[PDB]
């Protein structure tokens, strides 16, 4: 487990911490604008055969968070306080050092700070003759000073070097989702390496939205849809991140949607090894 880590140093507020389903859609729309139609299909074939990306997770100044495995909920008592056991079950994102602890079913600590805030700003709509207003509210993810968001990449390097690294320079100047004409999804991209110490077992947590091909072990269900060139995507049951499959490669699904081209929904897994309890 040596992964490339893409860091998205934010220039403004995001609309949401991007799922893998809206990272892959953004990459496909970048590739279709800087390369062409016939190079999105080679991207899709590279992700079918090889590579996988994960969801975006928050970072805050050289500490990188990863989602909590669901493998710790059924045997959180055997790890061990009732206040600690409850706060240790509520929490969503573990630190990289703790996350590698909890993959082996060891006692771990939750971070005492979230790297962003869901704030809703009031906006207004004024008619041009009478300046007569109308409020609506708008939610967004407002980050701290050194904090931001990142995701991980496995697979070969010519796919990263020909597809994902140009896609990230394109999407820095047209954002990842949301009101990107208000300067919302925009960022500066920079790449590092991350290494993850992971136990080699039969079970794997998925760091991206799964959409499985068989029933997993422990899961946390997540309906979402999308919007593809104006057309509404039907709601799909992804598995949320941090969920335990065994040997389940996931699967992308092609949609119809009445367009000039097929629309793939990225339903692949991102496996890290995990140690389970007896169930």
């Amino acid at each position: 487990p040596k992964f490339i880590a893409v860091k998205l140093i934010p220039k403004g507020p995001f609309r949401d911490i991007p799922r893998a389903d809206t990272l892959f859609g953004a990459i496909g729309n970048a590739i279709s604008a800087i390369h062409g139609q016939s190079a999105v299909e080679e991207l899709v074939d590279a992700f079918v055969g090889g590579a996988r990306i994960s969801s975006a997770f928050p970072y805050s100044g050289d500490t990188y968070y990863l989602p909590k495995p669901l493998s710790v909920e059924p045997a959180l008592e055997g790890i061990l306080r009732y206040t600690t056991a409850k706060r240790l079950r509520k929490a969503k994102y573990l630190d990289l050092k703790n996350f590698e602890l909890a993959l082996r079913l060891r006692p771990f600590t939750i971070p005492e700070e979230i790297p962003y805030a869901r704030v809703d700003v009031p906006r207004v709509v004024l008619d041009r003759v009478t300046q007569d207003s109308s409020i609506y509210f708008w939610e967004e993810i407002r980050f701290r000073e050194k904090s931001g968001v990142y995701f991980l990449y496995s697979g070969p390097r010519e796919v990263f070097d020909g597809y994902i690294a140009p896609a990230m320079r394109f999407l820095g100047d047209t954002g990842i989702g949301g009101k990107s004409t208000w300067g919302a999804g925009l960022f500066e991209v920079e790449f590092h390496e991350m290494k993850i110490d992971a136990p080699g077992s039969e079970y794997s947590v998925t760091l991206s939205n799964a959409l499985p091909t068989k029933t997993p072990v422990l899961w946390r269900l997540l309906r979402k849809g999308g919007w593809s060139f104006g057309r509404r995507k039907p709601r799909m049951t992804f598995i949320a991140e941090g969920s335990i499959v065994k040997n389940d490669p996931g699967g992308m699904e092609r949609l119809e949607l009445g367009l000039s081209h097929e629309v793939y929904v990225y339903g692949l897994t991102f496996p890290l090894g995990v140690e389970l309890p007896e169930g």
Partner: protein
């Protein structure tokens, strides 16, 4: 029938205890004279056979197996069709039921304090724990009248016995905190579970039902309620939310009643149904586990098909034996068999819809859409136009709840019927519900009362309680957020209080029998179901007394209870009558408990026309904020810091800082009028403290501004706790919001 004679015999065998404390007539023969005397007049010989269960329990007369025989020949088993085998078996079964269910009413919270005797009507005399042989005589007289009048059907006696025997202790001993109602309720529950398991008197005498996995705990729990009831956009009235909180209650009671009516059980088996989380006791036969699995697989599919992965019911069961209802050694066996089921609940909540098996497939129908009130997914139509604004399409089960929110005050109950009938408003997973206006079905749920009036003697009575105080509008219905925000002191806002009992699972994991758990769960239930509306009526001021109040408490306050349940509530209303109500409910929960349990409250003051998902996620976040700090707190108002308060801390502040600046009913003191700017600019001097707590400039500026709080103390700087200028935001800011802003 033996299967109802057993439950009635286990329900009327310790009825000889109030007639013996009264001193009318050996504790059992002097309790069987009651049933024997009642059997002749106003009734039949039905009551005559039920004196066997009082003569022959507690090891007083069931010796040698012959004194039963002359008396049971002296009565007629053939007139009721019972066998000499059957009723002689039912005596032993009721005896072991009482055995392995058992082991002034002292309070379950502080066992050092007792209860005065009362009836249970939620309209007078809040049973605060405190510190006569004729009051029992009046109890027995008024019980004799009711036991004369009522039907002998066991859904007709369980409303009677908890009117009267709730605050009566079962065994008169020191520190006994088990009600007599609940002792007899659980004795009957275990008796019918032994009979439906099929065990008999030779297994009773030979010591076989104990130490054999023969009982079955069923426990079920709703997951995802906060995204079911409060994920609602700006379309959707208050009456719509107040119909969401009574549609989830109807789903829950529907599932419980099919488990009872399909497993052949009575309502004595339900240990509790508080909070969307029920627990019942059942038999362990292999032709019952199959029925439970059918109930689970049908309820879960109706939940998936109706509310797509939004609400979920996690039903599990666990085989126990009779020896695990009590205490063996210093090892708690009921609280270990209950942690073996909580793990199955927890690991079943992580397989969130595994019963469906078509859940992860993609084969979608064409041309979906989305309701604007709740975000659903309805294909190419089936959206029905609303009757509020007929231009906007909504899903049909939002129309079914707008039309139910219209019929909230007019409602005496519900009738639970087969799903495709007339009058059916809303559907449960197994039944349709038709409201019971100003008498249809086989099962009539009747709210907030214990007396069946218009109900057929062929229908099942199920009494349920719901805290449903509301300010009524100029019409006869429910107020909206607009009428609530208008009628408040100060400016126009809306005060939305959540807030629940802290660390209660540790409290319920300490009970070492079901008879004790049933009492503790019923009292914690009845505080929020019943004794929270009696507060908002304006009672119990002898116990409540001094509270932070902006105005004299009105005759008819404007507060709408959205939910009030097992430990929590969610209450809206006039945003500066909600403020007095939070501290008033705290001061009454301190008194209802012995002081042993606490509650947190997150508060929010919203503009009246605000979406309800955000209006709920502000208060639900401020409850976690006021809860992870100290678990005895109150989030009084939003505040800035470098956030909540303790209760007694605020009520010690408000004795001091408030009565020197605030006169009453939204008016400041004399000569501090025309000095309103003195109250805001002090919050400027309060805000040089959050900018730097280390700079000491805020002392002489207060001394200057009061010359035109003032001094520091190392009592704060002994451990770096914040200064007294920091504990004045939530005391000045209320008085500013409720005087002319």
């Amino acid at each position: 029938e033996i299967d109802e004679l057993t439950a009635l015999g286990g329900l009327l065998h310790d009825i000889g205890k109030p007639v013996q404390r009264a001193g009318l007539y050996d504790h059992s023969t002097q309790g069987a004279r009651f049933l024997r005397d009642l059997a002749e007049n106003t009734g039949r010989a039905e009551y005559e056979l039920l004196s066997l269960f009082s003569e022959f329990h507690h090891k007083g007369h069931m010796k040698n197996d012959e004194l039963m025989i002359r008396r049971i020949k002296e009565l007629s088993p053939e007139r009721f069709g019972l066998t000499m085998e059957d009723v002689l078996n039912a005596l032993w079964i009721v005896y072991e039921a009482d055995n392995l269910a058992s082991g002034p009413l002292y309070s379950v919270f502080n066992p050092g304090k007792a209860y005065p005797w009362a009836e249970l009507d939620f309209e007078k005399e809040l049973p605060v724990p405190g510190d006569r042989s004729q009051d029992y005589r009046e109890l027995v007289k008024r019980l004799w009248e009711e036991l004369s009048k009522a039907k002998l059907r066991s859904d007709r006696l369980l409303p009677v016995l908890e009117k009267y025997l709730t605050f009566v202790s079962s065994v008169t001993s020191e520190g006994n905190i088990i009600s007599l109602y609940d002792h007899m309720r659980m004795t009957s529950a275990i008796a019918l579970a032994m009979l439906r398991a099929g065990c008999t008197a030779e297994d009773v005498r030979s010591g076989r039902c104990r130490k054999e996995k023969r009982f079955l705990l069923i426990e079920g729990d709703f997951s995802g309620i906060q995204d079911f009831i409060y994920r609602v956009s700006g379309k959707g009235t208050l009456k719509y939310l107040r119909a969401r909180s009574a549609y989830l209650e109807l789903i829950g009671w529907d599932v419980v009643l099919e488990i009872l009516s399909r497993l052949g059980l009575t309502r004595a088996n339900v240990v509790f149904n508080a909070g969307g989380h029920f627990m019942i006791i059942a038999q362990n036969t292999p032709d019952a586990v199959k029925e439970l699995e059918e109930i689970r697989a049908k309820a879960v599919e109706w939940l998936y098909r109706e509310f797509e992965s939004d609400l979920y019911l996690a039903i599990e069961w666990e085989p126990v034996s009779g020896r695990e209802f009590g205490r063996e050694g210093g090892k708690n066996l009921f609280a270990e068999a209950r942690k073996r089921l909580k793990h199955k609940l927890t690991v079943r909540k992580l397989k969130r819809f595994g019963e469906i098996k078509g859940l992860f497939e993609h084969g979608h129908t064409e041309r979906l859409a989305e309701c604007p009130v709740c975000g659903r997914e309805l294909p190419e139509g089936k959206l029905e136009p609303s009757a509020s604004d007929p231009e906007t399409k909504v899903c049909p089960t939002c129309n079914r709840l707008v039309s139910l929110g219209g019929n909230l005050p007019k409602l005496l109950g519900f009738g639970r019927t087969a799903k495709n009938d007339a009058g059916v408003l809303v559907e449960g997973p197994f039944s349709g519900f038709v409201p019971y206006l100003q008498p249809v079905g086989e099962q009539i749920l009747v709210k907030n009362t214990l007396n069946p009036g218009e109900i057929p003697e062929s229908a099942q009575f199920v009494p349920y309680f719901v805290a449903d105080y509301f300010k009524k509008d100029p019409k006869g219905g429910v107020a909206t957020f607009e009428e609530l925000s208008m009628a408040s002191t100060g400016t126009r806002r809306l005060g939305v209080m959540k807030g629940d009992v802290d660390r209660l699972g540790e409290f319920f994991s300490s009970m070492d029998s079901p008879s004790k758990l049933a009492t503790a769960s019923r009292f914690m239930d009845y505080f929020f179901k019943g004794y929270i509306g009696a507060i908002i009526e304006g009672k119990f001021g002898y116990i409540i007394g001094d509270v932070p109040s902006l105005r004299d408490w009105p005759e008819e306050p404007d507060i709408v209870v959205v939910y009030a349940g097992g430990d929590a509530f969610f209450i809206v209303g006039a945003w500066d009558q909600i403020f007095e109500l939070a501290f008033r409910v705290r001061r009454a929960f301190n008194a209802y408990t012995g002081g042993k349990l606490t509650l947190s409250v997150g508060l929010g003051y919203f503009d009246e026309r605000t979406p309800i998902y955000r209006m709920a996620d502000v208060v639900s976040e401020r409850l976690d904020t006021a809860k992870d700090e100290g678990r005895n707190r109150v989030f009084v108002v939003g505040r800035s810091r470098p956030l909540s308060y303790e209760w007694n801390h605020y009520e010690e502040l408000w004795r001091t800082y408030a009565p020197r600046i605030y006169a009453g009913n939204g008016r400041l003191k004399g000569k501090l009028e025309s000095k309103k700017g003195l109250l805001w600019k002090l919050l400027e001097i309060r805000e040089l403290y959050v900018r730097d707590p280390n700079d000491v400039r805020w002392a002489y500026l207060t001394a200057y501004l009061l010359g035109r709080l003032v001094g520091i103390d190392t009592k704060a700087v002994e451990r770096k706790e914040p200064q007294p200028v920091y504990w004045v935001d939530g005391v000045l800011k209320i008085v500013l919001m409720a005087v002319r802003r």
